[PDB]
From Swiss-Prot:
Its cofactor is Zn(2+); Co(2+). Target of drugs used in treatments against glaucoma disorder and breast cancer. Belongs to the alpha-carbonic anhydrase family. Changing residue 196 to H: Higher affinity for bicarbonate. Enhanced proton transfer capacity. The lineage of its organism: Eukaryota, Metazoa, Chordata, Craniata, Vertebrata. Zinc. Can also use cobalt(II) with lower efficiency, but not copper(II), nickel(II) and manganese(II). Gene3D superfamilies: Alpha carbonic anhydrase. Pfam families: Carb_anhydrase (PF00194). InterPro entries: CA_dom (IPR001148), CA_dom_sf (IPR036398), Carbonic_anhydrase_a-class (IPR023561), Carbonic_anhydrase_a-class_CS (IPR018338). This is Carbonic anhydrase 2. It comes from Homo sapiens.
Amino acid sequence: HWGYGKHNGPEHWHKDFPIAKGERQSPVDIDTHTAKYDPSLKPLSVSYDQATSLRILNNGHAFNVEFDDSQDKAVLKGGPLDGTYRLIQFHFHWGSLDGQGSEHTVDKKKYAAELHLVHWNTKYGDFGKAVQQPDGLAVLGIFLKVGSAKPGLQKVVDVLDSIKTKGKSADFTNFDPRGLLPESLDYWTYPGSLTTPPLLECVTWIVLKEPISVSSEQVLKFRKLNFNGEGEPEELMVDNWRPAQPLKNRQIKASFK
Ligand SMILES: CC(=O)Nc1cccc(CN)c1
Ligand SMILES: [Zn+2]
């Protein structure tokens, strides 16, 4: 099964998922000097005040905080998007060391981790139908650097002990994802894909320019999770990131000058 090891990692994924070599794969390096300011891009509209988080799950590849997406409770619109995209889950990618972990890079710089808030386009009715469409998903990507602690992340950190191994979940209600955002909503955007198998080319990426700061202790606790299930040999959940892929025939646009 696919994973992040030498024998099943990103360089192997194309054998079962040929789209891994497709025309709009993610992540990419964001070359800041060649991205283009687009004054027709609108401000991002993040409406999370009514979000209903439900559960946190170790799926063997990351941990997902899942939301009730049966109504327009936590939605992303504006920016490059047409219509309304509902939040379904967020997760992170991170490194074994502070110098790596992000999927997108900025002028080749790697951050310690990257947060993905995954949303689906409500005009397709459900996530499963949305991922059959080229505009089915919108992912808000946020870089993490190590410095001061992020208070709004601590509730996530302190439940991880209860979902150490693949397949474990815990109730995770009343979590406010607004506490994971930076101050500015200035962003880059480009058309891409999910960064995990099945690597579907459905995503409008919206990558925020401003990182959030998290403490060394917070990201250290991410690294105590396990890829394996209970009762199996322990494999620390670290370096669960896909490296940058060829940009090919795509333009990265900036919302700011
Ligand atoms: C596997 C899967 O579909 N999970 C999921 C996560 C969060 C919400 C929902 C309901 N749309 C489903
Ligand atoms: Zn992701």
